[PDB]
Write a protein that binds this ligand. Sequence first.
Ligand SMILES: OC[C@H]1O[C@@H](S[C@H]2[C@H](O)[C@@H](O)[C@H](S[C@H]3[C@H](O)[C@@H](O)[C@H](S[C@H]4[C@H](O)[C@@H](O)[C@H](O)O[C@@H]4CO)O[C@@H]3CO)O[C@@H]2CO)[C@H](O)[C@@H](O)[C@@H]1O
Ligand SMILES: *[C@@H]1O[C@H](CO)[C@@H](O[C@@H]2O[C@H](CO)[C@@H](O)[C@H](O)[C@H]2NC(C)=O)[C@H](O)[C@H]1NC(C)=O
Ligand SMILES: OC[C@H]1O[C@@H](S[C@H]2[C@H](O)[C@@H](O)[C@H](O)O[C@@H]2CO)[C@H](O)[C@@H](O)[C@@H]1O
Ligand SMILES: *[C@@H]1O[C@H](CO)[C@@H](O)[C@H](O)[C@H]1NC(C)=O
Ligand SMILES: *[C@@H]1O[C@H](CO)[C@@H](O)[C@H](O)[C@H]1NC(C)=O
Length: 438
Amino acid sequence: QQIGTLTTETHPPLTWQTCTSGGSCTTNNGKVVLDANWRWLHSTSGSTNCYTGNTWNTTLCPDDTTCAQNCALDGADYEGTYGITASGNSLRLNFVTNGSQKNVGSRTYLMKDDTHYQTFNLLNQEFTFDVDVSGLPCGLNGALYMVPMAADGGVSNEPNNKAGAQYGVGYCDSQCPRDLKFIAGSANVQGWEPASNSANSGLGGNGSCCAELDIWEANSISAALTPHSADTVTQTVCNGDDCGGTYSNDRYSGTTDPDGCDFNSYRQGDTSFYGPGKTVDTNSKFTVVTQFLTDSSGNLNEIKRFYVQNGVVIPNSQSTIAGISGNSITQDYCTAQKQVFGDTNTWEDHGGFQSMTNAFKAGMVLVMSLWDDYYADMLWLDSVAYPTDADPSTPGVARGTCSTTSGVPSDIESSAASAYVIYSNIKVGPINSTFSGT
Ligand SMILES: OC[C@H]1O[C@@H](S[C@H]2[C@H](O)[C@@H](O)[C@H](S[C@H]3[C@H](O)[C@@H](O)[C@H](S[C@H]4[C@H](O)[C@@H](O)[C@H](O)O[C@@H]4CO)O[C@@H]3CO)O[C@@H]2CO)[C@H](O)[C@@H](O)[C@@H]1O
Ligand SMILES: *[C@@H]1O[C@H](CO)[C@@H](O[C@@H]2O[C@H](CO)[C@@H](O)[C@H](O)[C@H]2NC(C)=O)[C@H](O)[C@H]1NC(C)=O
Ligand SMILES: OC[C@H]1O[C@@H](S[C@H]2[C@H](O)[C@@H](O)[C@H](O)O[C@@H]2CO)[C@H](O)[C@@H](O)[C@@H]1O
Ligand SMILES: *[C@@H]1O[C@H](CO)[C@@H](O)[C@H](O)[C@H]1NC(C)=O
Ligand SMILES: *[C@@H]1O[C@H](CO)[C@@H](O)[C@H](O)[C@H]1NC(C)=O
């Protein structure tokens, strides 16, 4: 994709901290950038759209290469169009913005400078942030996560990609998404079909695969921490159903792990721990600490989670499911959880902890998003039962308190139009350097 010249692109400033063993902390001047899919995409020779709603202009985009030559991503009005506001160390994302037209959700990335994403290697470190999920009801997901996107957005070896990280180009994840307009320096017009339900989306012939660390997927009801492995941790292109992932007819047939090794306190049997008025009280802001412990070789062997609220350090809840113990993500936990729940261990199949180690060594980009779910209504995160016809007595079926009929986008895009998430006070450093409390 090309650089559009009709609207200035100014990345909202966002500060975040680096801490050392001490724990003294200093402030980094980061910037955030909107993902390329949300942008106006128009001809390089004027204002004619290359894509509108769910449909490509086939004169501008007769094939994937020509489309990339002809089409430019332009600047974004972060607050006015997308409901994205950055102030100091806080980033607020609104679910619905009624601008000149309606916008639903957003996905953003943390930038080092105007043309490069910040990258992270969290091995033997922790990543910490504050979040307010009080405005997120059933069906919403404020996701803060990491994927090994190219720091430059792919421009170095993609001649038809001039827009790069400056315009939020280069996304990939463990679902191998085919709804992306640009993948690896080419458009995705070939094979495009508009979505059956969403007016804003569709699926092209190709998907964008990579490893994925879901540090945080949550609303006010439930939260999940989920690493996902991949054969190749950085971006690869896939085609059609062979992609695997959410919008494939053969979910597990691809080169990535679309399920991950998840820890949701509620799904792991503790329904008193996370939610409204619970131990981690989602009515108010809290701190989320995620630690990435290594073995003697420097390979990831454990992900620990702590919360801090009202000045109290709260260890992650113990899994209470018979056969699945502990309160952290380890190989023992992942093996046990998949065996006991009767889920395919695609996490292990695509390299598990070694894959995530390799993802960190490649360099992870921080993603902050807010979305609803046109595939499964977020029921996998927050439903009394997922699948909806499964027995709630069966371990692993219950994930939250939301009804099986909750979270339908056409419903919640009206009823939850006030929804929002605020991520703030990001801190990164050695283990135990980013937080304190009793
Ligand atoms: O065309 C003008 C029209 O544009 C919309 S903006 C619109 C984009 O055009 C469209 O490409 C994307 S598709 C988007 C999808 O809606 C969203 O549900 C998923 S959420 C995704 C999440 O971000 C990730 O964090 C998570 O890991 O996976 C989730 C599921 O994939 O992302 C898709 C893109 O990758 O949708 C936007 C918004 O509808 C303007 O809003 C509108 O006003 C204008 O008329
Ligand atoms: C991206 O997906 C498109 C659409 O499926 C692929 O397009 C096919 O490409 C082959 C080889 O060039 C052609 O023979 C077919 O005619 C194309 N099919 C269609 C429907 O257009 C394309 O190959 C994919 N790109 C990559 C890099 O995998
Ligand atoms: O595909 C949507 C959603 O999937 C989860 S994995 C999910 C499986 O889909 C389900 O079969 C099993 O019973 O539960 C697991 C865990 O919830 C994945 O973690 C997530 O990334 C994705 O959005
Ligand atoms: C597609 O783009 C061409 C070239 O700019 C333009 O002439 C035409 O009106 C557009 N067609 C549609 C259907 O948008
Ligand atoms: C960090 O603190 C946690 C919780 O208090 C403790 O379990 C752990 O031993 C500490 N780790 C280090 C490296 O100090």
